[model samples]
Target: FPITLKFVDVCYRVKERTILSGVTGMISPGEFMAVLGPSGSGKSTLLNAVAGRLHGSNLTGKILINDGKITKQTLKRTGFVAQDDLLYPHLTVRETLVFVALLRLPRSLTRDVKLRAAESVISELGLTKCENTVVGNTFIRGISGGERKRVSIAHELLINPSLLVLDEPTSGLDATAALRLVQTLAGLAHGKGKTVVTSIHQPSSRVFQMFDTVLLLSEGKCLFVGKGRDAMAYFESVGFSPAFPMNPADFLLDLANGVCCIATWFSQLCILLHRLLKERRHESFDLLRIFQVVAASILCGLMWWHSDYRDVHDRLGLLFFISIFWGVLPSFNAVFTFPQERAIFTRERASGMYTLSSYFMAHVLGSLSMELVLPASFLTFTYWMVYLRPGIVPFLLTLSVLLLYVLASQGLGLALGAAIMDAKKASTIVTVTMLAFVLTGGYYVNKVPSGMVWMKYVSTTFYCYRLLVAIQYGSGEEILRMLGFVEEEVIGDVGMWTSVGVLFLMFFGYRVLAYLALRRI
Candidate 1:
């Protein structure tokens, strides 16, 4: 049951950048070791090597478990926990850990036997108090961050690994919570006879004092590896001393590369914006979605093929159909956005990692980049094929209206999903509301009577349809009378520019509702 971890002369390089260069350290059973370093230091690289998750020609090293060679069977007794917690928000703590046991346990083990292993780990991690509580996310209120972390730990412990390694489990916790968590881990290492290896950026003095071994690293080189109490004495013996009575962590971090500073809202927004832009680009280019847009365009073009619009219904039907398609597609695509990533956002937000304002803007900015590209291409394909307007200005204005409406519909999806925080429920609501918008969108009925006249203003699809009509046939009463819209009540009493202004407003209006709903969580 007692196993030690050894990594001798480990070095990792990719593309001429030395991620880790000949760092070496080991932790024996019943001892807790802390790997301390700054951001660019190889704390995680070293852990990944030990976990056997990073194995390639890029690494030059020897990592041995229990003085034996590394192999899949040899490493099976080790468990690893990384920073990001990707979990189903609705599953309870017990069901979550039990599900993991059912998957990762030896297949020879009985189902009931795996359940007991799950049950033991839950009690072992002191997770009994919140066993029944569901793992909720940003919008759904659930367990505390510390407890959620315990659940993550419990999942790893169910395998009964003798060597357990965690990468900065204290990151998202407060000072008190961090202290409590590290202490619990300390007890697990010493009291339970397991080897515990954890990477810490900088631990508080009390946390640092609890570790049996403190391995200080600088650019993949191990500076000191010994008892935590001996660290100050060893560093002082080497002719480097702290200027004043400062915490040893502050002194050590200063030696190994000083940690960086605060991340303001704008900085985070810019960061998220950059990543999402790349994300949208990749997702948009994926062959399947491209095929989806192309097929829709081809089918739409084929159905309404170049027939002259001198006959009114076909032209009206063609333009309105385009409006409905763009509206419904973007709406449905984003309706799953918030609920799907709910747990991730809540975890990050709980850590005060970034402001909601920053995330939302980056989110909007990211989606905004690719949102118009596909729609523009789609409308371009069908515009010429449908034979709506060949004139340059007419085509441009119609397309401009289309791009804006797609974005407007996108915001409404985020609004519903964010506010509701349930994928199927928001999807259900959006589906019904989409139908409602279409009926009021001046298409099937062409007239909204009595209690629902204001619904026309709220319908994003209706506004874009009217704008496309105005773009195809100029805005005066004569064109309206000729086009058959004058026979009944009009969608709007306002002019072309007024409809443009209102359609533009739906863009932020829906976005703000999304922001407001997200904040309530």
Candidate 2:
């Protein structure tokens, strides 16, 4: 593909200030263009706008790639790398790169073809040393920062994009490392003929020598463009002396706040906008798997709690607390995962790997894995723990209700997470929401007043709490048989179904809302 990127009379504005104003430029195939600007010059903002990251900000520009408008081409053509290098901490370098490769691979490629592609790219990136090392977080042993940056670059190249937009790939590295990084990128561009555009603040002179073209931004406007060596000559033409081969990087830094360029509030606003939209996003949760997690955790915990219940009343109370706690812990843990995936989701969404439905289904599927260990574990554990007043049938029925209750709590956690994407906000909302349900959840107290009666309809905890007690110690066949009823029905099963129904409703409603909110973003 003949890569060409043009910004024509483009302008961008944030809440109160304009970032890029009437900016225009052109980059051709096999070109390594260094975008140079001082701390607040909006160089990064221009790269972001080109990547299609900023929304809600007013933009007027026709970004043309090889004579075609940007929007006309599929979004997969542009590969972007942000400053933070958002590599997944849990996955190894090879695994992370492989995942991106698989996601970017064409549909025509078979499974073997995809695996080969991933392996080839891994080798090409020269990440063989740290390839299998867990790309764990700072809290754990992991790859070096420089290696992580290379991994991020490898991830972008997995798509084999025609044009790559990088934001400060050299930001945190020392002089030698930064130079090597730029040289590596230069080699890729020259070797593959890919158009590479990057915003660099204070690149070393050696690093500057790698670029075929340079864009000097003053304030939000362009001051110069063309060859790196000639940058100083152009500055001299604009009325400045060339101080004995002064480093072009330093010269540009001094010129940042010069009359030619000025900082504005829009600068920071644009920077933040760019970071948030750096990648594709996933918004689905696995309901079935989560149900399993709840079942397992509560089962073990409740079983332990069961060893303390000495009488019928104690057993009933234990069941009640287990039901409520089922809703509590999982709600907190679910939100924690939300913040972790936010970056990768943005990147993947930027690529055309899948639509919203596929992305949502994938998340839901991943979550379903939790169900394997959760539900069965908890139900079985609690079954033998208290040794309640029941034979085989009653015991099994109570176990079924317990599992259903845990699943319902999983739904509640999902709803809470969807309502507030922020970890703190989501956590707070879950506490308050569950607290309300507990207060009016009828089992905690015998009777709620008429004014508070609506709480019963809105409260899932109250319903499940009563269901747990009724199944364990209250009126089902266990009580009715003892009282001499004819052909007794198991009230435990009834309570399980009722709780399941309520959770199903909550899950359906919140998931729909989650879809809407996520789409609007």
Candidate 3:
């Protein structure tokens, strides 16, 4: 159960600047080390390089566990809890740990064993009092920051990892909480025989005493890497003692950057099923947003009440508006999906919790039920209320096509969100992109210039609008006649099924791009 970590001459460069230079260290089992430094001193850079989380062409290092080269197998026994608690806000402390245990603990372990392990970690981290408390976000009311921080630690500990790497574990906590957290880490090292490496900023003297060793850096250079108690004397011997009996963490901060950083069918479907079920309870499944959509749908429905088929202008206008509605709004909603969850997804995915496809499908499928439901409700209110067409077949076809369009738009949104990973930036890009697509959607501009005709194919808006119109019109005579088309050939090729098929294809295509985008991140 003992873990030993060693890295030799670790060097990391970001662009033209070297962030970590010739850093070297070794931590034996039962040792707890605190990495301390001033602002931009490369504490995180070093930890990231050693953890295999840092990616670049300029990173060079020899990292070993138990004298063997670091591999995925070696990393299996490692646990890294990032500074931010990438937790599900709606999930309780107990549920959070249990979910992680389910995915991370050995498959050979039983449910009871996993539950017990989660409970044990909870108890160990002194989180038993808040076991049932929810991990809150900015929008939700839940656990205290310190409790949330402990829960984050408990998540990594659930795997029973011997090598624990924490980045700035004590950054935001107050003195009491920081000391308690460091004390628990010390216990894990001394009592459980684990090797714990944590980066800390501005820790108190009490907290500093808990670490067995200290790795201090200054401007990417190792100022000291030895026993914690000896750090002061070592500095003093090198003509660098503090003017007063100062806190070592504060003194270290004076020297460093300050802070901080699946599914298939059936068997595969079951895993995705669980994830979907779990996510349904998350904050992302906002009931308030659902009600907001309902309110908006009802309002729009009132404005477009029952149109006469003879009033081709009203009917066409309704159809075009619906096309834009399904195309843009759904994509708008979906764009925030990845941006909001990227941190949690990145952390979980990097840890090998589950495959990216599993995450993607679970996310898409989990929200699929609700995604379809909202639109169905909106369409139900608007379709009958607007009186577009009358027939079970036509109605069902319209609903199905619109749902497919929703999926495609959502897929595009996911691609944007994942690629940018910023809400503001992604939203801006989506708005501009959707605007272009809407203009070429075959409603506003029916005939594109020869140079830009390809825009129709690129726009999901075009396919969706064209198919919905075709489904309603049923023949090229009225459609072509009203639009003043010279030839039947143009309208003849507008196959309703073909548009649906293309939308479905785009759905998968955008999702693939989304997957690749996340991997790049």
Candidate 4:
């Protein structure tokens, strides 16, 4: 359990700008070292380098552990608790740890053993009182901020890595909570035989005394790194005497500073699918989402109540409206997934938790079931209410058409989302493009002044609507004549099989582009 960290002349530069300039320090085994720095200091960057995460040609230094150079095992032997406690708001604390144990606990450990480990972490962290509490998000209330941060600490502590590095663990906690939290971490360092290094901001004297060693950082450099008790002596040696004799932590310019899972793509897929299932279960059955689908269906059903099969205007309007709604819905929603999940995605992926292909497919497959059900339920209610097509075959055909159309729409959204991450910008782009498609979709303003007519062929909404019209009335011939396709207007993709051919093509192509976007990006 003895993990000794030594960094010699650790220097990091970003082009011309320097991030860490000749930072050198060492924290021996069982040392509770505190990295003291003000905002914009390079402490976080230093910690990231120590954790073996900061790489790729900008760094020039040697980080050593136990007199050996860094390697894959270096990161595996270290536990990093970042500023943000990225926990699921829906899960209780115990459940969160239990699943974490399942995913991260050493390979070949028994399930019962994993469960016991989680229970032990609860008691060890003094979280037994609120173990059952849900971890709430910014939008919702759950556990206190202190409790949430503790859960993150407990999460890393599960595997008990030799070196524990925390980046501002007490940042959001109250004063008392911060002291109590520091004590628990101190206990872990002294009692549990783990080396602990944490960053603190102007700690009280009582809390300051707990730090075994202190590294004072100023402007990307470690000004002083020595024993905590000798901090004043060190400052005196440097000729900086404070006007008022104050707390050493306040007086001194602070210098300061997952798992051994050899996971395969298949293994990663299983774990990710497990998490995705958990996420989608809460999201798909969300009270708000449940209300949305049902309300949208009933409202549309009432409006298009028993829409006439022969009344071309009403059917076209209803079909086009359905096309627009479902087409736009999945795409707009898809835009937000990567952006929102980007934080967790990068963190996990950086740690080599899974490949992008596994992640890409996990998202693709994970979303399929959830995405399919909403529309199916929407159709289940809307189909019979707005009775147009006759026979079970016709109903099934239309339902499958909608399902296929939904996939293509989802694909378009995924493709758009792959390259861009901002949801607002993506939403706006999707809306404009969808409206353009709606206009060219042969339902509204079809008298396009040439050039723009290509949008109809490209628009997923157009193809789906075209197929929906065909399914209702014995293929394309009946609707083609009824909708004035005989005149100077091509009502967008007159051939039914060809329209079917194009959507299937779009369904695959969009995902290919999305895959490539993620592949490169």
lDDT for every model? Answer: 0.79, 0.66, 0.77, 0.79
What TM-score, over all chains together, does every model reach?
Answer: 0.54, 0.81, 0.82, 0.89
Best by TM-score: 4
lDDT per residue for candidate 1 within 131-215, as digits (tens), equals 8887877866888888888888876786677888999898877888888888788998878888889987768879888888988
Alpha-carbon runs more than 4 Å astray in model 1: 258-521
When 1 and 2 are scored with TM-score, the better candidate is 2
Over 370-448, each residue of candidate 4 has an lDDT whose tens digit, in order, gives 8888889998899888997878998898888898888888887787777777777877887787777777877787577
lDDT of model 1 at position 11: 80
Candidate 1 has its poorest 10 consecutive residues by lDDT at: 485-494
Give candidate 4's error at residue 55 in angstroms. 3.3
Clash number for every model? Answer: 0, 22, 11, 11
TM-score between model 1 and native: 0.54
Error of 2 at 305 (Å): 8.7
lDDT of 2 by residue, 429-491 (tens): 878887887776655555456687776677767666666666555554455444441112223
